[PDB]
Design a protein around this ligand. Sequence first.
Ligand SMILES: CC1(C)[C@H]2CC[C@]1(C)[C@H](OC(=O)c1ccc(O)cc1)C2
Ligand SMILES: CC1(C)[C@H]2CC[C@]1(C)[C@H](OC(=O)c1ccc(O)cc1)C2
Lengths: 10, 228
Amino acid sequence: NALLRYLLDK
Amino acid sequence: LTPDQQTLLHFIMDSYNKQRMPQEITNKILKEEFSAEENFLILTEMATNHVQVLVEFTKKLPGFQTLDHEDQIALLKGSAVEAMFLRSAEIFNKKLPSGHSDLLEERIRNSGISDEYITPMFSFYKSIGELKMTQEEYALLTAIVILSPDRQYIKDREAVEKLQEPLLDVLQKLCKIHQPENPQHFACLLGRLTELRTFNHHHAEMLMSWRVNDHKFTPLLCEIWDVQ
Ligand SMILES: CC1(C)[C@H]2CC[C@]1(C)[C@H](OC(=O)c1ccc(O)cc1)C2
Ligand SMILES: CC1(C)[C@H]2CC[C@]1(C)[C@H](OC(=O)c1ccc(O)cc1)C2
């Protein structure tokens, strides 16, 4: 889940 | 009531209100009967919007940072539909000019969604309007939904429970603060949660059916809802 992980961490 | 509570309430409200719902997109479909595909494209933007502010609100929730990282994801994917429908309800009830409910229902039949699902959507929107839901309630209920410790794939329920309970405690003080004569308000709120829960199924069906009829989504919309 690379994309939500990016939007959670910044 | 409690200082710890007034701080929590306020942190939650600041964050919820920071989330911008530009209404150009909405005034687009209002004033123009587009083509099914072009409506759908507009929906795709609105859906993308929802996920984005979802994640921006969730990031900030006090303590969300301190949860194991795979629980973080699991809460997000589990709450997205419920939270997305709540925010949709707020927009229906606050950010649209009066007397356009029917017109908007036209626009949504037309976007390749079945009546079977439209009827429940707008009823929910209206039931919320009948409760004259406050900005506090939208933001609390949204946070309560996201921090549901009952979701699938949650390794550590209790940690999530810890963060959701104080939210629940606050919401019910405010129900009693602003409606001391209606002790049952809080319970009506929770009944709206149970009704929210029915959208998970409707949503999966809305997607499976869009997909069979050749609609394409976005990566991102595919991640959050595991379309593979
Ligand atoms: C009522 C709505 C139209 C509004 C609130 C929920 C919706 C069903 C839609 O969301 C999508 O799921 C969606 C998913 C993928 C896509 O390409 C477009 C929309 C945005
Ligand atoms: C009735 C509806 C299906 C119609 C208007 C309210 C809705 C819930 C929806 O609005 C958005 O989802 C939306 C999301 C973000 C944004 O900036 C604008 C609209 C389109």
